[PDB]
Design a protein around this motif. Structure first.
Motif, PDB file in Angstrom:
ATOM      1  N   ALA A 168       0.831  -1.192   0.000  1.00 19.14           N
ATOM      2  CA  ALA A 168       0.000   0.000   0.000  1.00 19.14           C
ATOM      3  C   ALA A 168       0.861   1.235   0.000  1.00 19.14           C
ATOM      4  CB  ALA A 168      -0.899   0.000   1.220  1.00 19.14           C
ATOM      5  N   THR A 169       0.310   2.324  -0.506  1.00 18.49           N
ATOM      6  CA  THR A 169       1.067   3.559  -0.586  1.00 18.49           C
ATOM      7  C   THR A 169       0.220   4.842  -0.593  1.00 18.49           C
ATOM      8  OG1 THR A 169       2.905   4.626  -1.778  1.00 18.49           O
ATOM      9  CG2 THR A 169       1.224   3.454  -3.104  1.00 18.49           C
ATOM     10  N   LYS A 170       0.786   5.869   0.035  1.00 15.37           N
ATOM     11  CA  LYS A 170       0.121   7.143   0.276  1.00 15.37           C
ATOM     12  C   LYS A 170       1.189   8.158   0.749  1.00 15.37           C
ATOM     13  CE  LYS A 170      -2.774   7.157   4.086  1.00 15.37           C
ATOM     14  NZ  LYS A 170      -2.920   7.250   5.570  1.00 15.37           N
ATOM     15  N   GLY A 171       1.092   9.390   0.225  1.00 18.15           N
ATOM     16  CA  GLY A 171       2.136  10.425   0.398  1.00 18.15           C
ATOM     17  C   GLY A 171       3.451   9.961  -0.188  1.00 18.15           C
ATOM     18  N   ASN A 172       4.522  10.066   0.568  1.00 15.26           N
ATOM     19  CA  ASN A 172       5.761   9.444   0.146  1.00 15.26           C
ATOM     20  C   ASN A 172       6.025   8.141   0.907  1.00 15.26           C
ATOM     21  OD1 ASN A 172       6.438  10.285   2.643  1.00 15.26           O
ATOM     22  ND2 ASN A 172       8.376  11.261   2.042  1.00 15.26           N
ATOM     23  N   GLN A 173       4.954   7.500   1.380  1.00 13.77           N
ATOM     24  CA  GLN A 173       5.063   6.265   2.141  1.00 13.77           C
ATOM     25  C   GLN A 173       4.563   5.059   1.344  1.00 13.77           C
ATOM     26  OE1 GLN A 173       7.080   8.015   4.534  1.00 13.77           O
ATOM     27  NE2 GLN A 173       6.459   6.058   5.364  1.00 13.77           N
ATOM     28  N   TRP A 174       5.408   4.022   1.322  1.00 14.08           N
ATOM     29  CA  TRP A 174       5.154   2.752   0.650  1.00 14.08           C
ATOM     30  C   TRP A 174       5.321   1.597   1.658  1.00 14.08           C
ATOM     31  CZ3 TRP A 174       6.863  -2.000  -0.720  1.00 14.08           C
ATOM     32  CH2 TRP A 174       6.358  -2.570  -1.906  1.00 14.08           C
ATOM     33  N   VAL A 175       4.298   0.732   1.722  1.00 15.44           N
ATOM     34  CA  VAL A 175       4.258  -0.356   2.690  1.00 15.44           C
ATOM     35  C   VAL A 175       3.939  -1.715   2.093  1.00 15.44           C
ATOM     36  CG1 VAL A 175       3.385  -1.142   4.931  1.00 15.44           C
ATOM     37  CG2 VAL A 175       3.395   1.266   4.429  1.00 15.44           C
ATOM     38  N   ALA A 176       4.803  -2.674   2.434  1.00 14.56           N
ATOM     39  CA  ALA A 176       4.598  -4.086   2.155  1.00 14.56           C
ATOM     40  C   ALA A 176       4.054  -4.781   3.416  1.00 14.56           C
ATOM     41  CB  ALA A 176       5.916  -4.690   1.756  1.00 14.56           C
ATOM     42  N   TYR A 177       3.023  -5.579   3.233  1.00 15.87           N
ATOM     43  CA  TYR A 177       2.372  -6.154   4.379  1.00 15.87           C
ATOM     44  C   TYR A 177       1.691  -7.477   4.053  1.00 15.87           C
ATOM     45  CZ  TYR A 177      -2.264  -4.302   2.874  1.00 15.87           C
ATOM     46  OH  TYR A 177      -3.446  -4.085   2.220  1.00 15.87           O
ATOM     47  N   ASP A 178       1.126  -8.096   5.070  1.00 19.10           N
ATOM     48  CA  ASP A 178       0.367  -9.306   4.950  1.00 19.10           C
ATOM     49  C   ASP A 178      -0.964  -9.009   5.546  1.00 19.10           C
ATOM     50  OD1 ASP A 178       3.132 -11.038   4.937  1.00 19.10           O
ATOM     51  OD2 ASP A 178       1.557 -12.135   4.115  1.00 19.10           O
ATOM     52  N   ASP A 179      -1.989  -9.449   4.875  1.00 28.72           N
ATOM     53  CA  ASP A 179      -3.343  -9.239   5.271  1.00 28.72           C
ATOM     54  C   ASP A 179      -4.002 -10.597   5.392  1.00 28.72           C
ATOM     55  OD1 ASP A 179      -3.430 -10.042   2.557  1.00 28.72           O
ATOM     56  OD2 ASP A 179      -4.873  -8.453   2.045  1.00 28.72           O
ATOM     57  N   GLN A 180      -5.291 -10.623   5.723  1.00 33.64           N
ATOM     58  CA  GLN A 180      -5.970 -11.886   6.018  1.00 33.64           C
ATOM     59  C   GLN A 180      -5.976 -12.809   4.861  1.00 33.64           C
ATOM     60  OE1 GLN A 180      -9.833 -10.932   7.987  1.00 33.64           O
ATOM     61  NE2 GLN A 180      -8.804  -8.931   8.158  1.00 33.64           N
ATOM     62  N   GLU A 181      -6.081 -12.262   3.654  1.00 32.24           N
ATOM     63  CA  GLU A 181      -6.076 -13.092   2.464  1.00 32.24           C
ATOM     64  C   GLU A 181      -4.719 -13.746   2.254  1.00 32.24           C
ATOM     65  OE1 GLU A 181      -7.328 -15.539   0.436  1.00 32.24           O
ATOM     66  OE2 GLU A 181      -8.992 -14.030   0.537  1.00 32.24           O
ATOM     67  N   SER A 182      -3.635 -12.986   2.303  1.00 33.82           N
ATOM     68  CA  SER A 182      -2.301 -13.530   2.024  1.00 33.82           C
ATOM     69  C   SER A 182      -1.891 -14.509   3.076  1.00 33.82           C
ATOM     70  CB  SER A 182      -1.232 -12.415   1.915  1.00 33.82           C
ATOM     71  OG  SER A 182      -1.070 -11.648   3.119  1.00 33.82           O
ATOM     72  N   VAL A 183      -2.332 -14.255   4.283  1.00 30.57           N
ATOM     73  CA  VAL A 183      -1.987 -15.081   5.409  1.00 30.57           C
ATOM     74  C   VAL A 183      -2.736 -16.399   5.323  1.00 30.57           C
ATOM     75  CG1 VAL A 183      -2.910 -15.132   7.744  1.00 30.57           C
ATOM     76  CG2 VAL A 183      -1.003 -13.646   7.190  1.00 30.57           C
ATOM     77  N   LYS A 184      -3.978 -16.364   4.855  1.00 33.40           N
ATOM     78  CA  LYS A 184      -4.716 -17.615   4.625  1.00 33.40           C
ATOM     79  C   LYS A 184      -4.006 -18.413   3.580  1.00 33.40           C
ATOM     80  CE  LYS A 184      -9.270 -15.943   5.727  1.00 33.40           C
ATOM     81  NZ  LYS A 184     -10.709 -16.361   5.675  1.00 33.40           N
ATOM     82  N   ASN A 185      -3.565 -17.685   2.575  1.00 35.08           N
ATOM     83  CA  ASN A 185      -3.056 -18.259   1.384  1.00 35.08           C
ATOM     84  C   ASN A 185      -1.796 -19.031   1.701  1.00 35.08           C
ATOM     85  OD1 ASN A 185      -1.174 -17.447  -1.226  1.00 35.08           O
ATOM     86  ND2 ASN A 185      -3.230 -18.227  -1.659  1.00 35.08           N
ATOM     87  N   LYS A 186      -0.927 -18.409   2.494  1.00 36.52           N
ATOM     88  CA  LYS A 186       0.265 -19.062   3.058  1.00 36.52           C
ATOM     89  C   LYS A 186      -0.039 -20.298   3.944  1.00 36.52           C
ATOM     90  CE  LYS A 186       3.292 -15.026   2.847  1.00 36.52           C
ATOM     91  NZ  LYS A 186       3.353 -13.604   3.321  1.00 36.52           N
ATOM     92  N   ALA A 187      -1.110 -20.203   4.731  1.00 35.84           N
ATOM     93  CA  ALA A 187      -1.603 -21.333   5.496  1.00 35.84           C
ATOM     94  C   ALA A 187      -1.989 -22.513   4.595  1.00 35.84           C
ATOM     95  CB  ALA A 187      -2.795 -20.921   6.310  1.00 35.84           C
ATOM     96  N   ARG A 188      -2.606 -22.229   3.450  1.00 34.48           N
ATOM     97  CA  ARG A 188      -2.965 -23.298   2.527  1.00 34.48           C
ATOM     98  C   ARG A 188      -1.742 -23.913   1.915  1.00 34.48           C
ATOM     99  NH1 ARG A 188      -6.230 -19.030   0.062  1.00 34.48           N
ATOM    100  NH2 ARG A 188      -8.075 -18.781   1.442  1.00 34.48           N
ATOM    101  N   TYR A 189      -0.820 -23.095   1.499  1.00 33.20           N
ATOM    102  CA  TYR A 189       0.405 -23.546   0.901  1.00 33.20           C
ATOM    103  C   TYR A 189       1.121 -24.518   1.761  1.00 33.20           C
ATOM    104  CZ  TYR A 189       5.210 -23.368  -0.655  1.00 33.20           C
ATOM    105  OH  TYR A 189       6.456 -23.694  -1.040  1.00 33.20           O
ATOM    106  N   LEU A 190       1.149 -24.271   3.044  1.00 33.69           N
ATOM    107  CA  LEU A 190       1.903 -25.157   3.919  1.00 33.69           C
ATOM    108  C   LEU A 190       1.167 -26.423   4.265  1.00 33.69           C
ATOM    109  CD1 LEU A 190       1.142 -23.011   6.756  1.00 33.69           C
ATOM    110  CD2 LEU A 190       0.866 -25.467   6.992  1.00 33.69           C
TER     111      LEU A 190
END
Ligand SMILES: *[C@@H]1O[C@H](CO)[C@@H](O)[C@H](O)[C@H]1NC(C)=O
Ligand SMILES: OC[C@H]1O[C@H](O)[C@H](O)[C@@H]1O
Length: 361
Positions: free
Chosen positions: A297-319
């Motif tokens: 996500a990004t706003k102003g001069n700030q850029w953020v990489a993160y994990d949200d509920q979807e990505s975290v589920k997705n990683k749970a499935r992968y494993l």
């Protein structure tokens, strides 16, 4: 399936709603709660904070509510010299002293095992790591004779190929270890001079130079090195990482002036809690690496990489699919533990999502 969750000591000092004590942890959320970190002193395991004996107590009283909850205590962390750990391990006498110090301490404070967080060993250290695990486990075996249930021994392991090759005999340590938590959240830093995600699941053929820098490499590679799947636990971050942008470029490759500004509550440059991130998302532009399957996500001069509920589920499935022992979470105190910041009225959104998924077919 294991759900190994880390609690940080120093989360107690954050102001206002940032303050997390072992109190707040729901005791049916995780399978194992790990308390970070312990200090070593006169070559013996020791407290770190001034009141760890209290916080230790407050955590281990959760087992009143869930008799099945397992708790461990992690030794080392980054705070703490590799230098120091190495010195203790490479000598047979300090090693022994430290090993004998461990069960009585664990028992006294009501923990069910030890997590080694040596971050991280050098190429000269790999030999002594193995020995230390070996010998520490033999000690847990010998103390089990006294009628108390055998202590668990686990280790925190870096997910970067260079680091694994330098510092870990995976094949060997896997035998004496009850599980290994693979730290699949560090795959980027501000030392690279652009934007990028730090937990990506797949390399994502945006452009391999690292095709090594993603969770899936790390996992295949540990299995290939001979970590049984059933001892392996994939680490899933709860925090995000921020970067101050150097231009209005924002996609892949976008240059970076350095780390993003401190969060209101965490107050460290370059990091945000998910609860601080849920708030940032208000008025931010959201994107998702299709390839790598993680959001930024990004706003102003700030850029953020993160994990949200979807990505975290997705990683749970992968494993699950990969048939691993479970997931490891860093960290509870950085998840939305009050359940007030992310819209929903759900506490530990990120961790619950994993847990739900871990229970599916
Ligand atoms: C940890 O132990 C070291 C080595 O004895 C000691 O000097 C240090 O002050 C301790 N650190 C903390 C934070 O308690
Ligand atoms: O990447 C360093 C990390 O390892 C430690 O175990 C924590 O997860 C810390 O932030």
């Amino acid at each position: 399936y294991k759900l190994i969750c880390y609690y940080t000591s120093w989360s107690q000092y954050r102001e206002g709603d940032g303050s997390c004590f072992p109190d707040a942890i729901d005791p049916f959320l995780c399978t194992h709660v790990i308390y970070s970190f312990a200090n070593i002193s006169n070559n013996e395991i020791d407290t770190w904070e001034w009141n760890d004996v209290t916080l230790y107590d407050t955590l281990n009283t959760l087992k009143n509510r869930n008799p099945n909850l397992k708790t461990l205590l992690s030794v080392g962390g980054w705070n703490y010299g590799s230098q120091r750990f190495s010195k203790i391990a490479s000598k047979t006498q300090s090693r022994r002293t430290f090993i004998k110090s461990v069960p009585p301490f664990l028992r006294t404070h009501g923990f069910d095992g030890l997590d080694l967080a040596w971050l991280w060993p050098g190429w000269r250290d790999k030999r002594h790591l193995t020995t230390l695990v070996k010998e520490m486990k033999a000690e847990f075996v010998r103390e089990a004779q006294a009628g108390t249930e055998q202590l668990l021994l686990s280790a925190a392991v870096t997910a970067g190929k260079i680091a694994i090759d330098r510092g870990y005999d995976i094949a060997q340590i896997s035998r004496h270890l009850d599980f290994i938590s693979l730290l699949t959240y560090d795959f980027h830093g501000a030392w690279r001079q652009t934007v990028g995600h730090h937990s990506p699941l797949f390399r994502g053929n945006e452009d391999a130079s690292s095709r090594f820098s993603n969770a899936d490499y790390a996992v295949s590679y540990m299995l290939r090195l001979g970590a049984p799947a059933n001892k392996l636990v994939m680490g899933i971050p709860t925090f995000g990482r921020s970067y101050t942008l150097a231009s209005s470029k924002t996609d892949v490759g976008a240059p970076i002036s350095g780390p993003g500004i401190p969060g209101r509550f965490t107050k460290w440059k370059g990091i945000l809690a998910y609860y601080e991130i849920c708030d940032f998302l208000h008025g931010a532009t959201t994107h998702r690496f299709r390839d790598q399957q993680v959001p930024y996500a990004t706003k102003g001069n700030q850029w953020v990489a993160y994990d949200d509920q979807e990505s975290v589920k997705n990683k749970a499935r992968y494993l699950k699919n990969r048939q691993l022992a479970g997931a490891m979470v860093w960290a509870l105190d950085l998840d939305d533990f009050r359940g007030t910041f992310c819209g929903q009225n759900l506490t530990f959104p990120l961790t619950s999502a994993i847990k739900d998924v871990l229970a599916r077919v």
